[PDB]
């Protein structure tokens, strides 16, 4: 039988995208979001009882956790998944690394002392999941996401915000004021690759996994390098710079490149979108011709 | 004159530190705290206050009423929510917070011979994991907010009057019972299982000493601290100096064996010696000696 999937919080950008992907593979009624396109329940992650009820009723074999709210909720999610032999995905992030981490590149196993509350929670998310795998039988799988780039990111704000918003200006061959200093390199990945990796790692055989947390990467680039690749399709496009030190500080704390050697060697992870295929696909979602 | 508070006060570690700090700073200048009723001798030894770390307001009340400036958090579902309360209050009122970490906060993927102050930390015990959490939240609060957070990674502590409380470190304290009367002891860990250990006297002094140091001298806020590392057969060997009829027999417990093997063998405490002058007094011989004179 194909898996039966739960996703939470499934109202987020990643949640919706993933449901679409997974519904296409397993069926519309095999993927249940939670927080018309398909099955949908209200679920309190914070309530173990509700969470237990859902898993049992709908016979859930796979769970993608995209949601103190983090911790109590994470712990709840961990407890339910372990008790009912559920394959659990929970994503991590490049925020899970800090200034004391090897930035160039960051390997899958290294120092992790993030100076941000989001980052610390994700270290904890990683460790708790692995702990549950080793102690109990929890099939825990975790991918560290780079900066995720998406056209439909009506959500503004974030460290990797410029790489989305920049296209709005480039589509009309306008000008863009960048939040980050010219030469600020960060790992980056287009949402298509990101969801595909999330699926793939959840399809991998257990024994081939040498660890349960993985870096995934596609590219790393700098604002001025993104502007270069943009001019391929809009030549008169200009890029000014007006820094937010709070967004720079956090950005400088993150790694420049993610080494994903293990993800490649263990479960054949490969990315399809480099900087050109990204730029093209993104500019296409605005009104721009990408033929050349 | 630092005004001191100690959560988890009824712990063997808590009483020992209170005993040390009161002797140095004055009886009324150091407060013990815990959720449950104390034994008789600690009531009289100095100030004591009921303090529920899970209730923010009760904890804030103590810190303001007794004008607290130094805090040593020995309390640790429950733990991590109490940590956050301790963190907030300490930051709010510019209190010097000490929270202990452990050797259990490393894992197989860590360097184990020796283990640096900065390295891969992926422990496989819920207790180790939550201590990594503790380290990061303390550090996070130092950089972001104005919190003066100071942490030491305690090795397996060896104390005189410890019960048979089942730590992985438990054999090193229970061994001294059978060895005091030349009897036989049965070890739960394998014969050659090396771990970092430390006599309680140093542990407390280190704790006091890192809090006395000035901020500028501190490169980081979580230091390892070392004294010795030994295996059961090495410990037995040192006990046979004072008791050659004492015997050791090995019935391995795979659970602790796995956890012991998950932890480091030696702790590199270079930074602590350079930064704030850390130096242990008790090596294996002295520890073995000192322990036997309380039997």
From Swiss-Prot, chain B:
Say yes or no: keyword Mitochondrion present.
yes
- The protein's organism comes out as Mus musculus
- GO CC aspect terms: mitochondrion
Assembly, in brief, is: Homodimer.
This chain's function reads: Catalyzes the NAD(+)-dependent oxidation of L-threonine to 2-amino-3-ketobutyrate, mediating L-threonine catabolism.
Q: Which residues of the full protein are shown?
A: 55 to 363 of 373
Q: Name one GO biological process term.
A: L-threonine catabolic process to glycine
Q: Which residues form the active site?
A: 127
Which superkingdom is the protein from?
Eukaryota
The protein's name:
L-threonine 3-dehydrogenase, mitochondrial
The record's subcellular location field reads:
Mitochondrion
Mutating residue 169 to A has which effect? Decreased L-threonine 3-dehydrogenase activity
* Catalytic activities: L-threonine + NAD(+) = (2S)-2-amino-3-oxobutanoate + NADH + H(+)
Recorded GO molecular functions are: identical protein binding; L-threonine 3-dehydrogenase activity
Q: Provide the family line.
A: Belongs to the NAD(P)-dependent epimerase/dehydratase family.
* UniProt pathway annotation: Amino-acid degradation; L-threonine degradation via oxydo-reductase pathway; glycine from L-threonine: step 1/2
What EC number(s) does this enzyme carry? 1.1.1.103
């Amino acid at each position: 039988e194909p898996p039966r999937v739960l996703i939470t919080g499934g109202l987020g950008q990643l949640g919706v995208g993933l449901a679409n992907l997974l519904r296409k593979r397993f069926g519309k009624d095999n993927v249940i979001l939670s927080d018309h396109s398909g099955p949908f329940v209200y679920a309190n992650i914070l309530d173990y009882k509700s969470l237990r009820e859902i898993v049992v009723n709908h016979r859930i074999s796979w769970l993608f956790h995209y949601s103190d709210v983090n911790i109590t909720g994470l712990h709840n999610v961990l407890d339910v998944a372990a008790e009912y032999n559920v394959r659990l995905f929970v994503p991590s992030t490049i925020g899970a690394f800090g200034p004391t981490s090897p930035r160039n590149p960051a390997p899958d196993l290294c120092i992790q002392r993030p100076r941000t509350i989001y980052g610390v929670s994700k270290v904890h998310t990683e460790l708790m999941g692995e702990y549950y795998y080793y102690r109990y039988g929890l099939d825990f799988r975790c991918l560290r996401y780079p900066g995720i780039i998406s056209a439909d990111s009506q959500p503004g704000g974030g460290t990797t915000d410029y790489a989305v918003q920049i296209f709005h200006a480039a589509a009309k061959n306008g000008t863009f004021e960048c939040n980050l200093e010219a030469g600020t390199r960060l790992p980056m990945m287009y949402i298509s690759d990101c969801l595909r990796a999330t699926l793939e790692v959840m399809e991998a055989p257990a024994e081939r996994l040498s660890m349960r947390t993985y870096n995934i990467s596609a590219m790393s680039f700098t604002p001025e390098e993104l502007a270069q690749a943009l001019r391929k399709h809009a030549p008169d496009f200009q890029i000014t710079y007006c820094v937010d030190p709070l967004r720079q500080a956090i950005a400088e704390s993150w790694p420049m490149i993610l080494d994903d050697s293990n993800a490649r060697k263990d479960w054949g992870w490969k990315h399809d979108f480099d900087l050109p295929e990204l730029v093209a696909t993104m500019l296409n979602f605005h009104g721009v011709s990408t033929r050349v």
